[PDB]
Amino acid sequence: SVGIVYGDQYRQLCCSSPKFGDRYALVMDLINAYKLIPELSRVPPLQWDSPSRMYEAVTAFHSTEYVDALKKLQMLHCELTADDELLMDSFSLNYDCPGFPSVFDYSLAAVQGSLAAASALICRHCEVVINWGGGWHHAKRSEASGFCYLNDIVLAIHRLVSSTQTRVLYVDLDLHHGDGVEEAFWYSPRVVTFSVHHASPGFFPGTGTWNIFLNGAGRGRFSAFNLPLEEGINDLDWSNAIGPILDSLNIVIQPSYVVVQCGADCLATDPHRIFRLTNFYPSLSGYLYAIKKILSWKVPTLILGGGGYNFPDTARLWTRVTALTIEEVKGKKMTISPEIPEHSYFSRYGPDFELDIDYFPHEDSIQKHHRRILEQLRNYADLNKLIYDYDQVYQLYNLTGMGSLVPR
Amino acid sequence: SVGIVYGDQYRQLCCSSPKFGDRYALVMDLINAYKLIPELSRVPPLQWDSPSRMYEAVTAFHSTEYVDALKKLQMLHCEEELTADDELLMDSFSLNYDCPGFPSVFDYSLAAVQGSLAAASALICRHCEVVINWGGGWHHAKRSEASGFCYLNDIVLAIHRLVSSQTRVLYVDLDLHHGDGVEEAFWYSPRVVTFSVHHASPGFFPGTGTWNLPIFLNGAGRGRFSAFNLPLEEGINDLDWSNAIGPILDSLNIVIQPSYVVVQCGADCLATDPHRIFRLTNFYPLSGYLYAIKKILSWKVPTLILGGGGYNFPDTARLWTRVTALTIEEVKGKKMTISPEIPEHSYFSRYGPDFELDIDYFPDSIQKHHRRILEQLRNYADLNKLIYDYDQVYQLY
Amino acid sequence: SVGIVYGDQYRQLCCSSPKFGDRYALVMDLINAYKLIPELSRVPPLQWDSPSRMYEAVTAFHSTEYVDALKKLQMLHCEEELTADDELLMDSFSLNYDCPGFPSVFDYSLAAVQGSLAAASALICRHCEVVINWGGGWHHAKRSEASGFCYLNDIVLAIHRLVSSTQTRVLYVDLDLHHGDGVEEAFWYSPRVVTFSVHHASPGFFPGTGTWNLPIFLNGAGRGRFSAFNLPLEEGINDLDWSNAIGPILDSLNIVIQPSYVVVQCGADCLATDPHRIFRLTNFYPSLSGYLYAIKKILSWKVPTLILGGGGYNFPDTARLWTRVTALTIEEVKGKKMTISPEIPEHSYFSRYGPDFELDIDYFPDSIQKHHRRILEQLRNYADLNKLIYDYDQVYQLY
Amino acid sequence: SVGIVYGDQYRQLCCSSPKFGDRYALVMDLINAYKLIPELSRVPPLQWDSPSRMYEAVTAFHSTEYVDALKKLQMLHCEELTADDELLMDSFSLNYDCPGFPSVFDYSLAAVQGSLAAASALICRHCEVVINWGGGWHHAKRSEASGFCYLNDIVLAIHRLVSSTQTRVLYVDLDLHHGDGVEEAFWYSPRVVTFSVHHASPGFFPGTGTWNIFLNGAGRGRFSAFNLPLEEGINDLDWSNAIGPILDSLNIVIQPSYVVVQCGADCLATDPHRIFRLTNFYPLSGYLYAIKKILSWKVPTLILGGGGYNFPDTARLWTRVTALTIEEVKGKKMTISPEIPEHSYFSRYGPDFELDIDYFPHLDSIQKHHRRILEQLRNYADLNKLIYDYDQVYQLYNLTGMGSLVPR
Ligand SMILES: O=C(NO)c1cc2c(Cl)cccc2s1
Ligand SMILES: O=C(NO)c1cc2c(Cl)cccc2s1
Ligand SMILES: O=C(NO)c1cc2c(Cl)cccc2s1
Ligand SMILES: O=C(NO)c1cc2c(Cl)cccc2s1
Ligand SMILES: O=C(NO)c1cc2c(Cl)cccc2s1
Ligand SMILES: O=C(NO)c1cc2c(Cl)cccc2s1
Ligand SMILES: O=C(NO)c1cc2c(Cl)cccc2s1
Ligand SMILES: O=C(NO)c1cc2c(Cl)cccc2s1
Ligand SMILES: [K+]
Ligand SMILES: [K+]
Ligand SMILES: [K+]
Ligand SMILES: [K+]
Ligand SMILES: [K+]
Ligand SMILES: [K+]
Ligand SMILES: [K+]
Ligand SMILES: [K+]
Ligand SMILES: [Zn+2]
Ligand SMILES: [Zn+2]
Ligand SMILES: [Zn+2]
Ligand SMILES: [Zn+2]
């Protein structure tokens, strides 16, 4: 069963932020317009029996002082002293992450959605669950960052990993380094994090690059993987870059769950304009390539949104991801019309009104990164007494003539 | 409120240089040890949405080829020896000798820029009345040249952002060395008045900010008379230094009426700086620095305070800690009581031998310059059609 | 209206190269000798408001560093020999061997750009239905490389301006003896510009492309897949066989693509009397000239069309052909019958047209079936990929 | 007496073109606003006693067929063209850069009327200097419109001057562009020496006035056409240093009976061309420096307009030029307020409302051009049997220590 997080209130809340406007509505209604919704099991967002149980859920990662401040920030904007200002600043509730009347509700909602998704996986109601309202990988224990206020991903992972030798693989496909999730599990071997991203001087947030690579500490050493890529990269190269690494991670780690953040700001048409990925499906979408690969493992999977600042193109991508998940899991062909279907956001898909993003692909190796990452994987396996099947990893990279990159 | 620039990454990068080592960490930890952090609005350093946007920000002052060179210099020091052609490229930008490469030289340099641009932004959006960046203040760097361990000129870029938001900016450079990079950048610009007080003497870095019968150059084009300089002989103490620049600061404020003040507060004027040229102190009963900062903060113009030179790291920290307390006092009107003894913290042992907050120190030409500076100011004011109570300006002397 | 690009300075620049000498002057003077010029609208070469706007126009295709190198090369040839470092620099852009520098290499190259951009503009604003630029058509030049006497690709820049007006689609038809590789490569990834080159190809023959590469034909990539068309032909082909080879392809490209504009490179090196001595086409207008057959066919479509020159190293015979192409264009567009005397009229260059002084050039005059099925399948694939409606047997009927 | 060309109908006509809008009105109204008009002798535009006399005057330079065409073009826009009228217009470049419009012939004629009347005031010695800010259309050819020039008022004016009664005219073209139309008209004539300083670079209009060696006239006109092409970016001082000694040398050797100066304002830093960086500053403006120099010769002088596409800044410069001419010719101090005076075009000088243009000035030498130019001047002097005063020219260049550039 493929689940998808949705609700009337959930939709209203996910659409109440100044930065992301009605993006979530575009996504879900495009998915709706393509008649995908009947194929999916609706996963209702989690609700609690009291403020204290809510508080307990959220402070499983975030500090009590941080959650209180975020509460007050909401309350304040719903009606600031010199000390109110300093309190909010001490949590970076400013600049990139300012208050607005529904800031706490907005932020809580993504947590409700992703915790519910996690719960649906744990009780085996869904093989895969999608939450396009979640995926806020930058929030820290006591700090808002990059439009992220509560880290729904950390909390969903914490629920999975503490369910019941249970390991979680986190795969971050967003343009940006998933610093908040990596940091939360820096000392934990059982959550292996892997972020592919752009990194360069001055580029947000600054981590996931050379320092050598830091890769976890204590019992968490070797458990935080990173692949920084240069700008301009297309679907095929991005696919080749991360494909073998994902399979090798799956072979060695043998995750009980996978969590995938699928931020769409790698699209060629994103306002960032750094990567040149597409949503094309025949020249194949780097995104769809990765998602299909992850789904072929038959490991219970949570698929989350994230970045993506071209709202219609983000909808175009995530609708195809959704159709693909249905195909890969239900074994059911999802034929998607090249023309955007009639619905109330139809006008936002102009001037072409077509499903493919309006981009024309056209045209540096990272083999040392592969070699480095495989050695880290070797070290992770040794530290945690896992089997490092050199045979299967070799044979994998050998499919491209790069078996030599694999350490014994 | 009073803002101050810091962050975890920011701290690591500011401490990544060979020359200034862990100085920034001593300063911030001492500020933290004295409990000043809760009084202050943390200002996060600027980050950008793409490499093009970063280049756009930095090449507002610096040439693109220089920035390319600086970035290549980093990559080279992260893999190596340079070839003859690379050495030649680096030399043509003075990325050599006093300004060598090191593994994180571009990231390190850019950090100061990130810090002081956010500081400027916080002032512009009026989130803070004053912002402190003890990681910034690199006043020697030129359009296409590293100089005086400055690789990128965070001050020029901060000031540019301020004038680009009719805005006039007053730049006050208290460092022991002439603030030539900033002065050169606005040589043709009357909207940014620069004023540096400094030591100058034959062969002393960087050589400018003094007689050039020779005369003082002071700006060109519409920027004529807009660059002010007061060179001072070695040995000057707090009182004489204060009296030297006091009436000038006050007259500049009266006539210019700046929308923003940017202060470079390099601590190499301290009697205990290894330069051993001036004899300023951090004393607060009076410190030249504390006197100047308070005079400037009395104007209640939104103000950026930056670091700079300072090669005795604990004494620099002792100085900038007092400056930070003073700012908290003059802006918020709230009494700050700093213990005379250094509090226990990570770096307590660096504060030997006595572990006091005061530094371990016991303590006509100026009139000529005053008359000259006063005629230049009148000239500037004339040329720019400004209102000047000359009946007032003169009595400051 | 039929436009033609000319001007006194333009003429001087187009005649400043050591390779093509005064060919352009011969062409325009023959056209003038035959009283065609009063029938045509003068299209003046484009000029720019500043160095920056010129650079912006040219670097819409070419890299800045290449344009810089080309301008440096001109200045270096204007003074007294190059240094070792300059030599290296020039070599990295192939500003050597076939494409050396000379005192006005950048102005000369730029002139053809100025003319073909002015031509494109005359079409877009609909001042002219067809525009001729016999100073243009330099199809071998690449983004950062000179090739085959081509320094700046005027055709690519003209086409870019055409598609950048206002789904505008452009059909490029390259009739030169040589494969139009620079144009094809520029639009390799664009479905909006369909390129089609008929040419000689054989081992060792310049530039080497436009043919089998069991090999098979490359034909575009990305969303540009199947959008590059090529028909390579064996040496010795005559007017009639060439016409029949190209005729059905041209007609079906127009049917399927329905272009908004047609850009035609009319390189005259396929002439029997070109010193290449490869193809045996004529300028005959009763067999009938392959060139005139193709142009009449393209003109019959009533699409705003850009006609450019290109190769052609027998200068009087290039003049003879393009004089006839020009007259045909005037006839086909204005409906006005043009009567050209079979003998060369007196004019300043009359001596060059010996020994017989006639307008006709002095000449006594399966594989393509597989190429046709191949090309038809590519066209089917292009239409499929691009959601184009067309028949199936109506397309097939033309064969 | 300093004359200035103006009238009510003249103003309306000069303001009737699509390209130059109401520029002429801004100029004249700013001059009026600074109270300069009472200092100036109004020179009324020339009118004729019959169409045949008008036609005779204009066809002293232009072909009958071009003027016929230009007349027809006006008639047409005062009523679609037939295919052949179109071909007729195209043959005269009455298109693109020089389209027809309702008053195109009246507009073009007006400038001729202004510059001919101006030449006549100089000839009969009514004025020692005459200004025509409606004239200076230096691009127009015998049978061809060019660079929005339709009729060449300058050629017609010069012709009137040079026919009055050893009489030589110096033509000085300060426009950003090469004065090709004037140069070409007098290419074979020694009694009109032309000098143009301008930008020239690949693709820049009109293309001439640069290396071809320099062409410099033919037949009896050999060596009589001078050109100084300059690279982009030049300031007041360098431009001043570039043409000052050449101008003084031209005056010494040629001994003009009249000077005609085209003072096109598109060398201003604030011109949308953005190529040179001249100002109108006056305590120094290149323009003011050149005009002051030319006036110091005490030779009867015609001052004309031309290019200039920042209309307020063109008015700002020509107003200053106008005051300077009054000052220099009458000996009468012309104090001009730094604030723009109240007048109906006051709002066009925002946001500063001051007379100085809104600009902050902030190996590349041409000494070989001086040497080349002085050599040409020597060649001219010999061809025409004139005194080449070596010593005076030497002493002139020796002021700047460059006497060695002067040939014997
Ligand atoms: O998408 C993002 N993270 O996953 C972010 C975007 C931005 C922007 Cl556009 C500005 C500043 C910070 C961030 S984080
Ligand atoms: O066995 C299955 N369907 O009949 C599948 C299970 C899964 C899981 Cl658990 C994850 C991803 C894809 C599939 S298909
Ligand atoms: O702190 C400084 N400038 O503000 C500088 C110190 C030095 C030294 Cl110690 C040697 C060489 C250059 C500089 S710049
Ligand atoms: O108004 C104030 N406190 O109540 C102050 C404002 C400022 C400014 Cl804008 C700059 C520097 C000091 C102060 S105190
Ligand atoms: O006409 C041509 N291309 O369209 C060319 C002729 C030649 C020759 Cl003759 C030698 C080398 C390259 C080329 S390209
Ligand atoms: O519509 C027309 N005449 O009335 C014509 C248009 C064209 C075009 Cl667009 C190209 C070639 C010939 C003609 S005739
Ligand atoms: O001012 C001019 N000549 O003296 C000219 C300007 C232009 C422009 Cl902006 C375009 C095309 C021709 C000309 S001539
Ligand atoms: O003599 C004069 N004023 O008293 C002057 C005559 C001239 C002439 Cl003819 C031309 C330019 C300036 C002056 S000043
Ligand atoms: K990522
Ligand atoms: K981990
Ligand atoms: K200083
Ligand atoms: K200044
Ligand atoms: K061809
Ligand atoms: K194509
Ligand atoms: K000129
Ligand atoms: K002449
Ligand atoms: Zn992102
Ligand atoms: Zn210093
Ligand atoms: Zn050819
Ligand atoms: Zn001009």
DSSP per position, D18-87: TTTTTHHHHHHHHHHHTT-GGGSEEEPPP--SSHHHHHHHHTTTS-HHHHHHHHHHHHHHT----HHHHH
- What is the residue type of B7? G
Say if CB B323 and CB B294 are below 8 A apart: no
Chain-chain contact of C47 with D95 (C-beta, under 8 angstroms): no
Secondary structure class of D102 (helix, strand, coil): coil
Domain extent at residue C338:
1-399
The neighbour count for residue B256, using CB atoms within 10 Å, is 25
What's the rounded Cα separation, in Å, for the pair C221 and A280? 14
Interatomic CA distance for residues A74 and A79, integer angstroms: 9
Contact C185, C338 (CB under 8 A): no
Active site residues of A: 138
d(CA B153, CA B60): 11
> Rounded to whole angstroms, how far apart are CA atoms D123 and D113?
15
How many angstroms separate the alpha carbon of residue A139 from the centre of ligand 1?
A: 12
The one-letter code for the residue type at D406 is: V
Cα angle for residues A160, A164, A166 (degrees, 5° grid) = 65
d(CA C228, CA C211): 11
Q: Which protein residues have their CB within 5 A of the ion that is ligand 16? A: D 186, 189, 192, 221, 224-225
Say whether B177 counts as a known binding-site residue. Answer: yes
DSSP assignment string, C171-200: EEEE-SSS--HHHHHHTTT-TTEEEEEEEE
Looking at the DSSP bridge assignments, the partners of residue D2 are D129
Dihedral through CA C137, CA C143, CA C149, CA C154, nearest 10?
20
The Å distance, Cα B276 to ligand 18 centre, comes to 12
Give the Cα separation of A168 and A261 in Å (integer): 13
From B47, B74, B127, residue closest to A205, measured CB to CB: B47
Written as one letter, the residue type at D325 is: T
Q: Which of A318, A384, A366 is nearest to A36 (CA)?
A: A318
Q: Pseudo-torsion of CA D157, D161, D162, D163, nearest 10°?
A: 100
**Rounded to an integer, what distance in angstroms lies between the CA atom of residue B25 and that of residue B12?**
8
Distance CA B270, CA C60 (A): 57
Closest chain A residue to B112 measured between Cα atoms? A202
Preferred mutation among B163, B222, B383, B384 to probe D, highest tally of D CBs within 10 A:
B222
Q: Determine whether the shortest distance from the Cβ of C49 to ligand 7 is under 6 A.
A: yes
Report CA-CA distances (Å) from C107 to C15, C51, C113, C158: 11, 13, 10, 17
- Is the Cβ–Cβ distance between A322 and A130 less than 8 Å? yes
Which residues is D3 bridged to in the sheet? D41, D130
Amino acid at C282: T
* Residue pair C30/C4 in contact by the 8 Å Cβ criterion: no
| Probe residue for ligand 7, chosen from D177, D204, D275 as the CB with the greatest number of ligand atoms within 8 Å | D177
Residue with the smallest CA separation from ligand 8 atom 6 is D298
Please give the angle made by the CA atoms of A243, A246 and A247, to the nearest 5 degrees: 90
> Chain C residue closest to D201 (CA)?
C51
Number of domains in chain D: 1
Asked if residue A214 lies in contact with residue A222, where contact means CB atoms within 8 angstroms, the answer is no
CA A223 to chain B, closest CA, distance in angstroms equals 21
What gap in Å lies between CA D29 and CA B192, rounded to an integer?
Answer: 35
CATH number of residue C334's parent domain = 3.40.800.20
Coil, strand or helix at C9: helix
- DSSP assigned state of A90: T
CB contact under 8 A, B54 and A206: no
| Residue D137 CB contacts under 8 Å (≥ 6 apart), including other chains | D108, D111, D148, D149, D150, D151, D152, D153, D154, D181, D306
Q: Is the peptide bond before D407 cis (omega within 30 degrees of 0)?
A: no
Instruction: Report phi then psi at B295, rounded to 5.
Output: -60, -45
Residue type, A291: I
| A-chain residues near C189 (CB < 8 A) | 360-362
Place of tokens 């698929």: A303
- What are all long-range contacts of D76-81, with beta carbons under 8 Å and residues at least 24 apart? D76/D100, D77/D101, D77/D102, D77/D104, D78/D102
Instruction: Return the best residue to mutate from A39, A121, A250, A329 for the ligand 2 pocket (most ligand atoms within 8 A of CB).
Output: A329
- The torsion angle over the Cα atoms of residues A92, A93, A95 and A100, rounded to 10 degrees, is 170
Q: Within chain A, what is the greatest distance between any pair of CA atoms?
A: 64
Q: Catalytic residue at B139? A: no
Pick from A367, A384, A406, A388: nearest CA to A251: A388
| Interface mutation vs chain A, best among C61, C223, C388, most A CBs within 10 Å | C223
What is the full DSSP assignment across B89-115?
Answer: HHHTTT-STTS---TTHHHHHHHHHHH
Q: Which residues of B touch A273 (CB under 8 A)?
A: 50, 52
**Neighbouring residues of C348: CB distance < 8 A, sequence distance ≥ 6:** C29
Peptide bond before residue C207 is cis, with ω within 30 degrees of 0? yes
Angle between helices A64-77 and A103-122 (to 10 degrees): 130
Q: Which experimental approach was used here? A: X-ray
Which residue carries 């149980």 as its tokens? A53
User: Looking at residue D262, what DSSP letter applies?
Assistant: E
Name, in order, each residue with C-beta under 8 angstroms of C277's C-beta and a sequence gap of 6 or more: none
What are residue B341's DSSP bridge partners?
B356
CB contact under 8 Å between A203 and B54, yes or no, is yes
In angstroms, what is the span from residue B278 Cα to ligand 18's centroid? Answer: 11
Q: What does the block give as tokens for A202?
A: 């001055």
Give the residue numbers in D contacting C (CB under 8 Å), as ranges.
Answer: 83, 86-87, 90-91, 93, 95-96, 201-208, 211, 232, 272-275
Task: Return the ligand 6 atom nearest residue C304 CA.
Answer: 9
Query: What is the C-alpha to C-alpha distance for residues A363 and C321, in angstroms, rounded to an integer?
Result: 39
Which residues are CB-contacts of B81 (< 8 A; sequence separation ≥ 6)? none
Strand order in the sheet with C130-133: C41-43, C2-5, C130-133, C305-308, C261-265, C170-174, C193-200, C228-233
Q: What's the maximum distance between 2 C-alpha atoms anywhere in chain D?
A: 64
Q: How many CB atoms neighbour CB D310 within 10 A? A: 20
One DSSP character per residue, B258-289 reads -SEEEEE---TTBTTSTT---BB-------HH
Ligand 19 centroid–CA C176 distance in Å is 5
Contact criterion met (CB below 8 Å) for C124 and C165 = yes
3-state class of A267 per DSSP? Answer: strand
Ramachandran region, residue A331 (left: φ > 0; alpha: ψ -120 to 50; beta: rest): left
- Taking contacts as CB-CB distances below 8 angstroms, the residues of chain A near B42 are 89-90, 92
Cα four-point dihedral sign D135, D141, D143, D147? negative
Residue among B226, B236, B242, B293 at smallest CA distance from B264: B293
Distance CA B99, CA B77 (A): 13
Four-residue CA torsion sign, A369, A374, A377, A383 = negative
Q: Residue B25 class from Cβ within 10 Å (0-12 exposed, 13-18 middle, 19+ buried)?
A: middle
Q: Which tokens hold the place of D342?
A: 């109240």
User: Resolution to 1 decimal, in Å?
Assistant: 2.1
Neighbours of chain D (3+ CB pairs under 8 A): B, C
Nearest CA in chain A to B118: A95
Ligand number nearest CA of B209 is: 11
Whether chains C and B touch (3+ CB pairs under 8 A) is answered by no
A227: CA distance to ligand 17 center in Å?
Answer: 15
B38: Cβ contacts below 8 Å, ≥ 6 apart: A86, A90
Residue A189 in contact with ligand 1 by CB distance below 6 A: no
Q: Cβ distance D216 to D222 under 8 Å? A: yes
